[PDB]
Amino acid sequence: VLSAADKTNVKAAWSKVGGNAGEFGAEALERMFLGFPTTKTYFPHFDLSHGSAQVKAHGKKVGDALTLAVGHLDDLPGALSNLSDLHAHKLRVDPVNFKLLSHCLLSTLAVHLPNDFTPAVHASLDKFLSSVSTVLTSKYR
Amino acid sequence: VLSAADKTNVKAAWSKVGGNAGEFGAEALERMFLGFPTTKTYFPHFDLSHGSAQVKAHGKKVGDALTLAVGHLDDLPGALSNLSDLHAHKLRVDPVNFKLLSHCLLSTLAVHLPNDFTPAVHASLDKFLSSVSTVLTSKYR
Amino acid sequence: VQLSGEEKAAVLALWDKVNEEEVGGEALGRLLVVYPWTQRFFDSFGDLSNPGAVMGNPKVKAHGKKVLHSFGEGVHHLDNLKGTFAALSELHCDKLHVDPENFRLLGNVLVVVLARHFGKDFTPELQASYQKVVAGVANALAHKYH
Amino acid sequence: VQLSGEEKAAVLALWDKVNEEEVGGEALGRLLVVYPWTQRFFDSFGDLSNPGAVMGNPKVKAHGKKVLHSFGEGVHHLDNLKGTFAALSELHCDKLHVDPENFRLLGNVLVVVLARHFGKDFTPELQASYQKVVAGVANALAHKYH
Numbered sequence: 001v002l003s004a005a006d007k008t009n010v011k012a013a014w015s016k017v018g019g020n021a022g023e024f025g026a027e028a029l030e031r032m033f034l035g036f037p038t039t040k041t042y043f044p045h046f047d048l049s050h051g052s053a054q055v056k057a058h059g060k061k062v063g064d065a066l067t068l069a070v071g072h073l074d075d076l077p078g079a080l081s082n083l084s085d086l087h088a089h090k091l092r093v094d095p096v097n098f099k100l101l102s103h104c105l106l107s108t109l110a111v112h113l114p115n116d117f118t119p120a121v122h123a124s125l126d127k128f129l130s131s132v133s134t135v136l137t138s139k140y141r
Numbered sequence: 142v143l144s145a146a147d148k149t150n151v152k153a154a155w156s157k158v159g160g161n162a163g164e165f166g167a168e169a170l171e172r173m174f175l176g177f178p179t180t181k182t183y184f185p186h187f188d189l190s191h192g193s194a195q196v197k198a199h200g201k202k203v204g205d206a207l208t209l210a211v212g213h214l215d216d217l218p219g220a221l222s223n224l225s226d227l228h229a230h231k232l233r234v235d236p237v238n239f240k241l242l243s244h245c246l247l248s249t250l251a252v253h254l255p256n257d258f259t260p261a262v263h264a265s266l267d268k269f270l271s272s273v274s275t276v277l278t279s280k281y282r
Numbered sequence: 283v284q285l286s287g288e289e290k291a292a293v294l295a296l297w298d299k300v301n302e303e304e305v306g307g308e309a310l311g312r313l314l315v316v317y318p319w320t321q322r323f324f325d326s327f328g329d330l331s332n333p334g335a336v337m338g339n340p341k342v343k344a345h346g347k348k349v350l351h352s353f354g355e356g357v358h359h360l361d362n363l364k365g366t367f368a369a370l371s372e373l374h375c376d377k378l379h380v381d382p383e384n385f386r387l388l389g390n391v392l393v394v395v396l397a398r399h400f401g402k403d404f405t406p407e408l409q410a411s412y413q414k415v416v417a418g419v420a421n422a423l424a425h426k427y428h
Numbered sequence: 429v430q431l432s433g434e435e436k437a438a439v440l441a442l443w444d445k446v447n448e449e450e451v452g453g454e455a456l457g458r459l460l461v462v463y464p465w466t467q468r469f470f471d472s473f474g475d476l477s478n479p480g481a482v483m484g485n486p487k488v489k490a491h492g493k494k495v496l497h498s499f500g501e502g503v504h505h506l507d508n509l510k511g512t513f514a515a516l517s518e519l520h521c522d523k524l525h526v527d528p529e530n531f532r533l534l535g536n537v538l539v540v541v542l543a544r545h546f547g548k549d550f551t552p553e554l555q556a557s558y559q560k561v562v563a564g565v566a567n568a569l570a571h572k573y574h
């Protein structure tokens with residue numbers, strides 16, 4: 001899927017996310033639960049309130065994985081093996097929910113990186129996050 | 142995406158398609174144009190009538206590619222390079238139309254291979270054809 | 283929806299030959315087999331771990347009738363697709379929280395089942411018809427979503 | 429649709445600060461950039477080959493107004509989403525043959541634009557609201573499809 005300007009562009013942009021990935025991450029979580037609440041279904045054990053420290057907890061996890069992936073663009077199926085299992089196998093996440101995370105994450109990025117969120121950069125991040133997601137449901141495919 | 146029982150299962154089933162892939166192929170084309178005519182949009186130069194010899198022409202092409210792919214399961218991005226270009230780059234095929242080919246192709250198979258179209262075999266063919274399609278739109282991703 | 287009035291007679295005359303219990307069960311068996319994320323919503327049916335376990339499962343069959351059986355009504359009811367499912371479009375949103383792209387998923391595997399069962403009687407044209415119908419239904423089932 | 433009546437006031441009061449011409453253009457520029465298959469339907473605008481060519485393009489801008497501008501109406505018109513687009517749901521089915529999953533695509537990039545432009549004023553809750561709205565519209569635009 002990923003062309004080398006995609007690899008380039010992704011790395012570059014992730015470089016600008018910086019160590020905000022954690023928070024960008026648990027903010028992309030907030031937005032999803034508000035704007036697509038179908039999704040909370042999957043976090044019954046969680047306090048979903050309006051700055052839950054689990055969600056906190058969680059988005060650092062998610063921002064962390066994302067960051068790992070960036071690392072392993074060339075070998076994503078490997079990098080996310082353990083985690084393709086967790087979402088595909090154990091939890092059985094309807095894949096359509098990746099598409100909404102994805103977006104809530106593009107949306108977070110744009111709020112905060114508005115200068116940087118160029119179209120170019122917008123579309124790479126889209127493939128990236130789409131490639132990421134296929135890996136995260138390949139354990140269905 | 143593809144697990145080795147998927148690779149196994151795909152090969153196996155394709156073995157049963159035999160040299161019918163051509164026709165299964167231009168039958169999966171007929172069904173699509175009737176049941177999703179949004180799609181004819183892409184074959185304006187074609188006679189779409191009720192046994193067009195272009196469509197004929199065409200499904201042998203498509204059954205042929207499919208058959209090639211089966212060949213190269215381990216290296217699909219390579220195998221379909223030339224053809225990822227043609228659909229992504231030149232024609233700019235809305236990917237949602239792959240999902241409908243896909244199905245019209247599962248549907249053809251079941252009509253004709255009803256014994257063989259076991260659930261097991263049904264789901265592999267689905268990944269396969271889904272993997273195929275990603276490759277055929279990766280030149281967007 | 284609409285369709286057409288030959289489209290209408292051919293649909294019905296098929297449905298006539300449709301065994302709701304065989305066909306409902308296999309429709310649902312594949313759904314969970316082919317799109318295993320669907321299994322979340324049916325964990326209560328216990329063991330779905332492999333395809334044989336699934337197809338065999340008896341609740342699975344039951345319940346596939348039920349659904350085939352509602353589908354049934356919509357085929358008979360094409361003028362009033364929303365009016366019909368509203369209490370189940372209700373069901374399916376509020377209580378179960380099922381993405382609609384699933385009802386469409388299902389609508390297709392149904393069709394592929396009907397295909398397997400009717401062989402060459404399942405025509406191109408006749409497929410189309412059902413693709414509408416199934417569409418039609420998949421839709422009525424997302425409307426009184428809000 | 430409906431939403432809610434705080435949901436309603438906050439939506440409107442935003443729209444108020446929305447520049448339809450900047451925002452329409454960038455909404456559409458990304459659409460074709462991010463989902464390049466969309467370019468089929470706009471080949472008439474000539475050269476779209478790279479992102480700069482695209483954003484610059486003047487017809488692109490024009491036309492993004494137009495759309496932002498219809499979206500505009502739906503925001504103002506939330507009771508009667510179908511009634512409004514029917515002549516354009518018409519447009520978009522018959523003559524142009526655009527898959528509806530595109531109107532939804534667009535609805536999102538719109539949103540992401542609005543996001544970029546309003547920074548932290550774009551809230552979670554406020555996002556939601558628009559996700560409905562945009563949804564609402566994307567829908568009205570597939571109904572009088574048949």
Ligand code: HEM
Nearest residue numbers: 039042043061062065066083086087091093097098101102
């Ligand atoms: C966008 C890509 C995603 C990534 C990188 C991702 C990553 C993660 C990670 C890193 C964990 C670590 C859990 C741990 O060891 O505590 C996890 C767990 C989990 N994920 Fe995601 N996930 C993604 C998308 C999703 C989606 C789309 C959903 C569902 C809609 C989801 C739902 C869950 C659930 C329900 C768990 C169990 C977590 C717990 O109970 O602590 N994730 N995921």
Ligand code: HEM
Nearest residue numbers: 180183184202203206207224227228232234238239242243
């Ligand atoms: C299911 C996977 C598909 C495969 C393997 C496939 C394969 C092909 C092949 C093998 C060709 C060869 C053309 C030649 O050299 O004459 C081709 C061309 C073409 N394909 Fe497909 N295709 C696929 C899906 C689609 C889809 C989804 C569409 C559009 C909805 C499509 C539309 C076209 C068009 C419009 C051409 C130009 C053909 C001509 O004018 O002769 N194909 N494709």
Ligand code: HEM
Nearest residue numbers: 320323324348349352353370373378380384385388389423
């Ligand atoms: C074509 C789309 C679908 C239709 C027309 C449909 C139809 C129905 C009907 C008619 C009922 C009986 C409701 C009642 O009167 O209590 C029902 C209940 C239920 N549905 Fe479906 N369904 C669809 C798809 C799905 C999907 C995709 C799932 C989950 C993956 C699901 C999960 C359930 C379950 C588990 C029940 C049993 C609930 C009970 O015993 O109260 N349905 N559905």
Ligand code: HEM
Nearest residue numbers: 466469470494495498499516519524526530531534535569
């Ligand atoms: C949110 C979904 C969309 C809405 C609400 C929308 C809205 C509109 C409106 C209000 C018009 C003017 C129609 C007239 O009065 O003649 C129009 C025309 C047209 N639309 Fe869109 N549109 C949407 C998505 C798209 C997409 C996704 C495409 C293709 C990828 C497209 C292609 C066209 C083109 C090229 C015109 C210019 C036609 C002319 O000058 O007659 N639209 N659209």
